[PDB]
Amino acid sequence: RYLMDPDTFTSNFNNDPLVLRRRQTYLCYEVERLDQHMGFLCNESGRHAELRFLDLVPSLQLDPAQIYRVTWFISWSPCFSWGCAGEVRAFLQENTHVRLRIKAARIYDYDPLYKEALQMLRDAGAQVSIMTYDEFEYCWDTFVYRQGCPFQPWDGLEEHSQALSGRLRAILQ
Ligand SMILES: [Zn+2]
């Protein structure tokens, strides 16, 4: 399994919501039977990482008889205005053996309809939450070519996480 460069992780999962950023997304995934698959995806040539994960589901050769928990540690919450939330809704509505957890570093405020994405994902059975120190360090330890270096928090990690978490819980009340 391949690991991402540390600077790519840090640049993409920094959770300060008031920074101007390129609209790139990184999505670290793990899939476990409730038989594991792990990896990471970014947007490529206009196709969002969420859809690329859906693209690769068949290649994972999951047993249609079993239940699987899929976890996404995603740098941006999935969009509405470019169809991600709806495709994820479709996927989950049919593939009822998949339970999806979405832990987002940041809310995708670049999408005017981001709240509709969050609400739609919830209504389809996905568990959506905001990444905390725990998740950032887990992703550093699990998906990053860190060469034994411990995780070091960026300025404001905990504050941003708590503010975004309050936003998200307010939206999904
Ligand atoms: Zn999208």
Numbering used by the authors: 190 to 223, 232 to 241, 250 to 378
Sentences copied from the publication:
Human A3B consists of tandem zinc-coordinating cytosine deaminase domains: an N-terminal domain with a pseudo active site and a C-terminal functional catalytic domain. The active site has a catalytically essential zinc ion coordinated by two cysteines (Cys284 and Cys289) and a histidine (His253), with the fourth position of tetrahedral coordination available for directly interacting with the transition state of the hydrolytic cytosine deamination reaction.
The crystals have two protein monomers in the asymmetric unit, each containing a zinc ion bound in the active site. In both A and B chains of the new structures, the loop 1 residue Arg211 is flipped out and, instead, the adjacent residue Arg212 projects into the DNA-binding groove and interacts with loop 7 Tyr315. In contrast, Tyr315 in chain B shows an alternative conformation differing by a rotation about the Cα-Cβ bond, in which the Tyr315 side chain is flipped away from loop 1 (χ1 ≈ 180°, trans). Importantly, this trans conformation of Tyr315 was also observed in the open state crystal structure of the A3Bctd active site bound to a TC-containing ssDNA substrate, where the Tyr315 side chain lines a hydrophobic pocket that accommodates the –1 T base. However, in our new apo A3Bctd crystal form, Tyr315 in this alternative conformation maintains the cation-π stacking interaction with the guanidinium group of Arg212. Accordingly, Arg212 in B chain is positioned differently from that in A chain, but is still blocking the ssDNA-binding groove. Of note, the two datasets we collected using different cryo-protectants showed a slight difference in the conformation of Tyr315 in the B chain. In the new crystal form, Arg210 is released and flipped out, replaced by Arg311 that in turn occupies the pocket between α1 and Trp281. The three distinct conformations of the loops 1 and 7 observed in the apo (DNA-free) A3B(187–378)QM_Δloop3 structures collectively represent possible modes of regulated ssDNA access to the A3B active site, in which the closed state of either loop 1 or 7 (or both together) is incompatible with substrate binding.
